[PDB]
Amino acid sequence: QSMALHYYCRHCGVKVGSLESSMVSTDSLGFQHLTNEERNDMISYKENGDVHVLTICEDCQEALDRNPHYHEYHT
């Protein structure tokens, strides 16, 4: 199944790596004994990857490419 790092966007807070998590249970960490999804990750090695990366989404990339560093701070 299509699995990798969990992508959460820098600044705009969009989930860039979580859409098909409904059937692709690789997004949820097997904490203890929650759902069947957690039961699957309950293996002695996080199958979900243990990866929470903050990256640029399409939107922010365009904030990037269309605006120099996506505007300035204040001055």
24 binds Zn ion (CB under 5 A): no
Between residues 42 and 60, which has the closer beta carbon with respect to Zn ion? Answer: 60
Output the six-digit token pair for 46: 């996080």
9 binds Zn ion (CB under 5 A): yes
57 binds Zn ion (CB under 5 A): yes
Between residues 2 and 13, which has the closer beta carbon with respect to Zn ion? Answer: 13
Tell me if 48 sits within 8 A of 28, measured CB to CB. yes
From 69, 1, 11, 13, select the one nearest 37 (Cα to Cα): 1
Distance of alpha carbon 40 from alpha carbon 54, whole angstroms: 25
The binding site for Zn ion (CB under 5 A) comprises 9, 12, 14, 57, 59-60
Binding positions for Zn(2+) are 9, 12, 57, 60
